[PDB]
């Protein structure tokens, strides 16, 4: 779900929400995808 742009807030903290708003939820920034796409893009070119 991190590769598909879903941040689970129960996974990076304790929760004391469910609705899709950055005042109380958190925005996910896809920075892991580019490093994985090198390597599945290099296996295509071997």
């Amino acid at each position: 779900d991190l590769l598909n742009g879903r941040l689970h807030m129960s996974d990076l903290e304790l929760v004391l929400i469910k609705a899709a708003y950055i005042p109380d939820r958190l925005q996910h920034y896809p920075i892991m995808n580019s490093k994985l796409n090198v390597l599945r893009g290099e296996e295509s070119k071997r």
């Binding site: 742009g5 899709a20 708003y21 950055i22 005042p23 939820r25 958190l26 925005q27 996910h28």
Partner: protein, 226 residues
């Protein structure tokens, strides 16, 4: 304002002034004048009553309510669009745009010929008697007491019946309590600080709350998650 404006009658100030043997000739007649002077000199908006009243415009002119002191806003009754100050020098005068208004006395000069306008204005809270009604905040009461005391001592000192040190002390105390009251009636509450915060932090700024009646000045600015 953190505190609430619980209203009490004017002679609550004469309860407190006449403890002083040098202020025993003060009266409700003097209390009314100096209290109105203090209310105006302080200019605190929480002391006035918020009222809304609709009028009709005959031709670029309309009759104004009796108790009006200041206008928060004017808008068109049917659209709800708020009005701005009229910069035009030749409004209702023809030769041979966005609506606006102007108010001087009992007349409001709008730029519209025939329409009904909603005016949100401020007035004074009155008593069962037709007299002003003051907050019971002891800061406000103490500052008004010091205002009346300072005026009366200024008169007596012009007469030479008060030592200059006495008047200097009275003026010093009144100045400090005037600053204290000004801050007390101005500093926002927690609920008002939420409005201020929602206004302040805006990734996409909102700059059109005047068109509405500043309804959405304080709404939170929610950004969707992508």
């Amino acid at each position: 304002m953190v505190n609430n404006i619980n209203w009490v009658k004017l002679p609550v100030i004469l309860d407190r002034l006449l403890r002083h043997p040098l202020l025993t000739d003060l009266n409700l007649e003097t209390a009314i004048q100096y209290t109105l002077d203090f209310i105006s000199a302080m200019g605190l908006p929480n002391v006035y009553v918020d009222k809304i009243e609709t009028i009709d415009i005959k031709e670029y002119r309309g009759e104004l309510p009796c108790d009006l002191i200041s206008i928060n806003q004017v808008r068109l009754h049917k659209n709800g669009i708020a009005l701005r100050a009229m910069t035009d020098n030749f409004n209702a005068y023809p030769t041979h745009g966005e609506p606006s208004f102007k108010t001087q006395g009992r007349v409001i000069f709008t730029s519209i010929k025939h329409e009904k306008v909603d005016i949100s204005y401020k007035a004074i809270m009155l008593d069962d008697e037709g007299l002003p009604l003051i907050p019971d905040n002891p800061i406000f009461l103490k500052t008004l007491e010091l205002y009346i005391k300072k005026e009366w001592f200024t008169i007596l000192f012009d007469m030479g019946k008060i030592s200059p040190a006495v008047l200097n002390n009275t003026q010093q105390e009144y100045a400090f309590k005037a600053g204290q009251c000004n801050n007390e009636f101005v500093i926002p509450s927690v609920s008002e600080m939420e409005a201020i915060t929602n206004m302040w932090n805006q990734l996409i700024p909102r700059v059109t709350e005047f068109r509405r009646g500043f309804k959405n000045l304080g709404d939170k600015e929610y950004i969707r998650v992508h």
